[PDB]
Symmetry: D2
Subunit: 144 residues, 4 copies
């Protein structure tokens, strides 16, 4: 339900996950530095806490407040309680991350204050919410 | 909006397509014999004539009449008016076709009476209906 | 050992093939137009009539003779009579063809004159010369 | 020229890398446990210490010594000092390691005594030897 790859500090390239989505719950992908700061989470909510089919990006110093939430449109949530294979890319640009889902670009997210790369750890987290079709991690990938 | 590939009478293997879904309209795929009987239409309705997000499968003799509709669930329609890249795979067994979309099998469909293989033609067709983002075809593939 | 995909006249995009190579014999690819002109042959000669691991491109009007042969370095022939899976890609540019194998560019081949696009037939041919491990076709693709 | 991904204790699935091959030198792939044993090394020697196109598999206790060298045939070494893109796959199976390159399985390797999984680190080490075309890493991936 939780799996991660720990990389040599990364200032370039990108990161990919592929997983089978759930009908209920949420899938989180965290980018961490060494000091355990959250440089970025892409938080994909299918059914999480009274929210359905919403995507959230944010950031956070270790033990400190989340910034302003970014709520982009375009994320391939499936209709009607359906599950599919999701493929995501987070490319580490000079000025921000770029988030792609299934080969279509979703958003450019400029680095938050004092939260630039390097990235050292890229984590996958599925949190259930009485889901009948649970999520399945398929692959994790570092790009060079 | 209409494009197709023609094969050596194919009794085995499978067939694939990759396309950017529209937000309104419908995307259909047609597998023909040489006399142009429709051995199978995998028909994807994004917004068609009152129906939203429904998949219809059927067959038909060249200018005869459509058989029963099968409407299976699990096809990767996106929520909220969103578009994604979709991938379809129709596999050619001994006894029927198999449908995979985005890595996941959707239905096994036995051949209808007097409509067995081979396939000689495989055809992508997109039919608009005031789409704000129209479908874009990306590839067509035959597998051996 | 021979397979093809016919398309509606194609003036852009690319065509793609995957095969498992042989240790003897040649595997060759043909881009025909409606008039049955060879707009391009891409001829991988593993061991064939006294030539080992040589790639030859050419064109040749339906009937007429061949023109200048072309033999570029780069083609991923395996050592020591081993075989492997191989992926080739031919793109239809504005003034020429770009040929790629295994995501690496092999040659820009400028269109021979009076012999430009459209392309309506792409075709794999395996011709054997006593191979122990024999070629095998895996896919043929049209790109839009 | 040296990049790793560290993982949880991994006991099934696989691990793939993708590189553009060098013309001279070697590309080694190490699978370490947490006690820094080499559970398996996969050593593509393109031109290294007077040996041309040789694959050595082996294992080794941390600061102990090597084992008997396995040397399988069939590694997709390019002829003639040409470089190409190699994909490799190492599966962590029940009774052993299954090696694969370009979708074609190359050999099995039973876990050596006192040298079984979990894996915790997968490492890519390019070590040059006056190469013309230098190896370039493309991706590292974990498989679940």
């Amino acid at each position: 339900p939780i799996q991660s790859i720990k990389v040599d500090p990364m200032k370039s390239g990108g990161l990919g996950v592929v997983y089978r989505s759930p009908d209920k719950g949420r899938v989180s992908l965290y980018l961490y530095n060494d000091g355990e700061d959250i440089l970025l989470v892409v938080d994909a909510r299918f059914d999480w806490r009274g929210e359905q089919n919403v995507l959230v990006l944010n950031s956070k110093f270790a033990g400190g407040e989340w910034g302003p939430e970014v709520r982009p449109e375009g994320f391939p949530f499936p209709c009607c309680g359906y599950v599919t294979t999701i493929t995501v890319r987070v490319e580490i640009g000079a000025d921000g991350f770029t988030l792609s889902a299934n080969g279509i670009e979703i958003v450019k997210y400029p680095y938050r204050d004092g939260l630039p790369p390097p990235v050292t750890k890229f984590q996958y987290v599925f949190q259930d919410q009485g889901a009948s079709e649970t999520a399945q991690l398929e692959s994790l990938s570092a790009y060079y």
